[PDB]
């Protein structure tokens, strides 16, 4: 019975993926999707291209709706009618909408045809995860849509500079992205909800603190810890709940707008909050780690160069820079961390680096690479540890 | 070890894949992708729904270049290098292209980083199927693009008015969807090109032409099979294959620059092209089948009533109307018959239809179901055999 | 591929039981002999009857070779003709030999055609275990050979008398059969090593010792556990080893030569070794649990209950009488509780018991269940608390 | 869920099996025992040595008594009752005997505890498979019991001689194995209904005998095929079946009382029966085709050569003798085939022989491989191809 074949398939993948860790089960995802690209017909392949499009705006529209959030906290399963009637949209529409995200799982559809809530609705009802979803929609998407014919016009031009790429014919602008999002209201409300969604797992899995500490003394009144761009404050926040008891400061640098975000969710003591522009030299001087946790991929080489030269003034030799960021492998690079490089590079100008690219980079400003500390798999994010060459 | 039960599950599912038939490989990839949706963790669904949609664009690209054609009749691998050299492509560039297209095998790479067609390489170079994709990316991304704000600015209505839905914003027109294609060139060319790919399989794989032909006379002159927007006429072709001492008149309908465009691949003789409209009276009359397949899920009710309603007049009691379409269940739909519903909603003002709701359809005609023959698995087509009531 | 496939379900099934538990892990090894069973051909089926039990002969010739343990203990793979020079066989006789073992995996031949320890192997080098296989070979292969011809001659009876069964033709002998091993010194020596045979799981491990007690009282001298044919005492250890401050008398019951030889590995406090017969009355007197652990099973009912009615005068209204054996389903019966009884029948006239068959059993005696509680699965192996009717 | 994932694994190996061919299927089942004996635990496998030996005890009592073919006509499930009354047995010994048997699949038990048959009953069914069990249990298991004690009795001798092997101590003579077989009734009706039992496939599936013909020509009055100790002739019926006008005479040779038996079943022409005891000179001569199938490994060298140099003599250029026999490989030898070589060592003194084996002993005869014919897979059988030298 293909039924029972295909139920057999699941449960034991399903066993596998219970049985392994975080990491053997993306393996396991990755391999789902490849089996799935490689056995699908021809016609199949161009109905997935055709159609998966669909979900962003599907979601985008049970976003407005509100409908995940409802459909999360409810404790039975409720008919199409009554999701239509309590979130205020027409009958057919709402009992299409959701036999397509049925489908997709964005919602469970139940053998009466009432309908529950996933694991995919319940992402989207948290607050930073539909506002990525929302990014992709809204920021994106038009700037994917124009690449195309961007690059047609222009006789497919290697991209370098943030201030000639796609974004700049999807928005209609000739400013760089990072300051025409300054100037819009909806985006930058929706960016900064972007700002609290924390990855898991992070940098401190792995990161052998004590082993790169090693005879640094916070005496007097030095700084371990220097978060460049901490957006939040997380990465200080977490090292100081891992290392509770460890001396020295710990200092999130961002902009004012955004410290004054923070302030609500930081610690009432421990961390400093230091508004620094980091195209300005760094006034922290002497610092263990300066730490740039996913700034320098929006940012084409010669930008991310001038970020890390307004470091590498203020390095004594026990300083280290460490960049937590993508470390794509040189072959076989996983669709999130390719995928990634097309749309920053269509929006920013900016690129993915291997590891030679960062070390090529890091040269530049004068700085070697002393250990490498990955904590994701199998795509690539790793804190580099530089040093003063 | 990780990496081994990842290789033992494809493994085991590609044998399990080729030992089936294209019917049970259909379901295990629907079950492949229900299992990477129940198996991701909430950033994967963000980066999934953010991801997925740069692979149109980067077909669009690689169509653009003439990438997969070239890719496919390369007889050694080629390098990034070669490749940019050859297609006109900035060499940082067509490397970034690879990679990424590498990692959604849209083509593949070796172990010296060297580029193969894959069979995604080998469909993209097909004329009809290459404009599937490009038909996505230039008609169906737009509509789906202006879905969410269209719906939210008209409080979510029920949408069933082809010059009224999400068509109208996203082209900034008053026309709808057909008629607006129809002023534009180079969108009515890949329409054209889209009309050479021919599904498999087709309706005379289950249909029971004897049992429903029975003791049915062709003289003097009536027609045993009248294809109505019959496009290049494969459903004509395949029946005179399949049957060719099988008496009566067999007609391609279409409007004239369709027929124009069949007249290659038509046989030289036994199958008629008629220039007709089918907003217009049926000028074949008693035919045993009036043959409509892919026609009328592109109109809402209203218009698809019409349609009907000009061929009924022209029926005798041995007449048959054979809608070959969707007929998507009432529970458990699957993504590629609920994706396609909300498409032709936001283009066209359509929807797919039940069985249910397609004999409701009928039945205002005039007409009965007679007999249901479906020919594909588990997404639903189905020849539908109509009688007047 | 055929290989790929196989080594691919190897992996898999591999990876699905490293990640169960003890239980689960049998449950699979029960599924793959199932799975063996149907998929084998006819002929297969009367090969694998032909040669199955050419294991236990040829284990036993490793045995007196001492092959196993040597193996055992060997630091690099050695070649047959180290084996055989090493221990004193003909070297045409090792390679023969350790082919077939390599086979039955009962050694592992390396690529290089030598020779390693295997699972098994260091299995059947562990005194006990060595002892077990022996046990098969002298004493159970001969009733077994003995049976069919038995059953025939006597018209199929139902065996009840440990004197008139298969034992009898297959030793020429009117005795029953634990009577005649104790006249054989070989015999009866390799039981003795058999008793050193731990089981694990063991009953402490489900048994709620603490709801067993409640109030129950051990002053001035009362028994807390007495084990009655306790062997090594394994049971005493256990207890004293997971209970050590609950207070009572341990007393390990056997006959003389056993205590002796049970003396070496008792704890030097703690475990009393009283000299007891268990077909004579029971001396401690109102003991909270007299404790009978794959006893009872190897006695016909008639002297079943004989060994019970030497209990019960001796209990209280507290004391209870823990039968810890077999309790194979009513239906659905795996092969090594099916197998066992068979093999007990043909040796010692009994029989393994269900549930309703214990309690049956156990009411002639005047006692009546409390509690079962399971801690082997999926064959059953329970302790049983029965109190005074 | 344990059993969930069981059941799946199941239908899983299930799905694999059926899809593949038979050679495909034999490679899965030794897979499955593999996995079996790596995951036991050293209580399990001294459970399996103790009681894997009473299928063959139990399968003898259910032949005794007629079960398996009285269960393999039943057309519905039958009572442990109903079968003990109808059989002639005792009502609990029936039903502890089909318990047992329901464990190892020789029967099923149903649900509501009853039995039907299996494909392990239908094969017991059939009497020359019923007569290999048999001959296992009464000839196979004597010596196989023998064999250790033999070999520490002799000090572990190679054993190369028909006539000093453990046959002589399991049944208390001084003649061979074949010799002493003659003089005994029951035995020799057994062996009698050996014959009949035709191995599937044969050598006939990938024999090139066109290719192997060459220009050999029938003509006068020469023999294709001379099938020495051919039995029941099965190698002359399918020659003649598959190749039914090659001209040229089909032999069939061995002794009077084989002949008289295989009339019955033999064409009633196209086949001549020839009286000749293989240890004497061949009669016919310069036959293409001298054929010995599954002869020569009953046979120690001296007398195995013997057999050739009877033949040799009759040979001219373009005779070959065609060695039909196992060929096990020089490493990884499977259970099936280094299994028979420890029985045939045991019973005949013989053993099986490798390629380069086969080749010293044909040498030994003036002969010279030609080529070999594998035609079961994963246990090698062959039909080996010899020249003179
Ligand atoms: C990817 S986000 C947050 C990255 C942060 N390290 C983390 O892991 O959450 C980039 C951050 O850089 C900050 N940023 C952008 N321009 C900046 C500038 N010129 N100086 C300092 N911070 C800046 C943004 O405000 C935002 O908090
Ligand atoms: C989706 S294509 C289907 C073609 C065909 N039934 C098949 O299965 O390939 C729709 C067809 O309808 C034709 N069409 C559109 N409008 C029409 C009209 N008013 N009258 C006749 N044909 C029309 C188009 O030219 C096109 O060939
Ligand atoms: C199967 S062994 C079981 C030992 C112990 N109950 C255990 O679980 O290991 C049976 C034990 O019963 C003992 N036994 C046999 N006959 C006995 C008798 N008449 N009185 C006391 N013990 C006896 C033997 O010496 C042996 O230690
Ligand atoms: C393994 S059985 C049958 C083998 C046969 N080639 C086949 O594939 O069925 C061995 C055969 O050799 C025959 N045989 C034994 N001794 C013989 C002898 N001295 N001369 C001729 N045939 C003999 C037996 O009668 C029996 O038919
Ligand atoms: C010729 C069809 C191409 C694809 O667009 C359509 C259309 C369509 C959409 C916009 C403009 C004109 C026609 C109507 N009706 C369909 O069914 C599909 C499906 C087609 C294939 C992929 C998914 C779509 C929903
Ligand atoms: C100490 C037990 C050894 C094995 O023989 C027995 C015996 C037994 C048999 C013959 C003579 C004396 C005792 C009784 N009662 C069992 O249960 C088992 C099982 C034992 C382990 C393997 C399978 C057997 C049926
Ligand atoms: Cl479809
Ligand atoms: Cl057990
Ligand atoms: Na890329
Ligand atoms: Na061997």
Not at 149 to 160: G, H, N, T
Not at 241 to 246: D, I, L, R, T
Not at 251 to 273: K, R, Y
Request: overall charge negative; charged content about 20%.
């Amino acid at each position: 019975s293909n039924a029972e074949t295909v139920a057999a398939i699941k449960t034991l993948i399903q066993q596998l993926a219970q049985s392994t860790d975080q990491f053997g089960r993306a393996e396991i995802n990755d391999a789902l999707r490849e089996l799935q690209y490689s056995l699908e017909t021809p016609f199949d392949t161009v109905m997935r291209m055709s159609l998966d499009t669909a979900q962003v705006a599907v979601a985008r529209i049970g976003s407005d709706l509100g409908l995940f959030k409802h459909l999360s906290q409810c404790a039975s399963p409720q008919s199409a009618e009554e999701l239509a009637d309590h979130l205020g949209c027409g009958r057919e529409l709402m009992s299409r909408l959701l036999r397509y995200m049925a489908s997709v799982r964005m919602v469970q559809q139940t053998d009466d045809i009432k309908y529950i809530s996933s694991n995919i609705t319940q992402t989207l009802a948290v607050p930073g995860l539909e506002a990525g979803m929302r990014h992709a929609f809204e920021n994106l998407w038009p700037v994917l849509m124009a690449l195309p014919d961007f690059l047609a016009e222009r006789k497919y031009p290697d991209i370098v500079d943030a201030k000639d790429t796609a974004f700049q014919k999807a928005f209609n602008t000739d400013q760089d992205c990072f300051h025409w999002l300054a100037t819009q209201p909806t985006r930058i409300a929706n960016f900064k909800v972007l700002l609290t969604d924390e990855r898991t797992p992070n940098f401190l899995s792995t990161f052998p603190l004590e082993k790169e500490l090693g005879s640094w003394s916070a005496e007097p009144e030095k700084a371990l810890f220097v978060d460049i761009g901490g957006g939040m404050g997380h990465a200080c926040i977490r090292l100081r709940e891992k290392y509770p008891n460890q001396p020295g400061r710990v200092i999130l640098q961002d902009l004012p707008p955004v410290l004054q975000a923070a302030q609500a969710t930081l610690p009432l003591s421990g961390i400093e909050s230091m508004p620094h522009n980091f195209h300005t030299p760094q006034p922290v001087q002497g610092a263990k780690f300066y730490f740039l946790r996913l700034i320098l991929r929006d940012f084409p080489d010669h930008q991310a160069l001038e970020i890390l030269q307004n470091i590498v003034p203020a390095m004594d030799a026990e300083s280290r820079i460490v960049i937590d960021d993508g470390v794509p492998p040189e072959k076989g690079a996983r669709w999130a961390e390719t995928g990634t490089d097309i749309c920053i590079m269509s929006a920013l100008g900016s690129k993915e680096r291997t590891q030679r690219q960062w070390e090529e980079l890091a040269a530049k400003a004068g700085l070697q690479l002393q250990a490498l500390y990955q904590y994701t798999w199998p795509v690539v994010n790793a804190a580099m540890v530089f040093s003063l060459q």
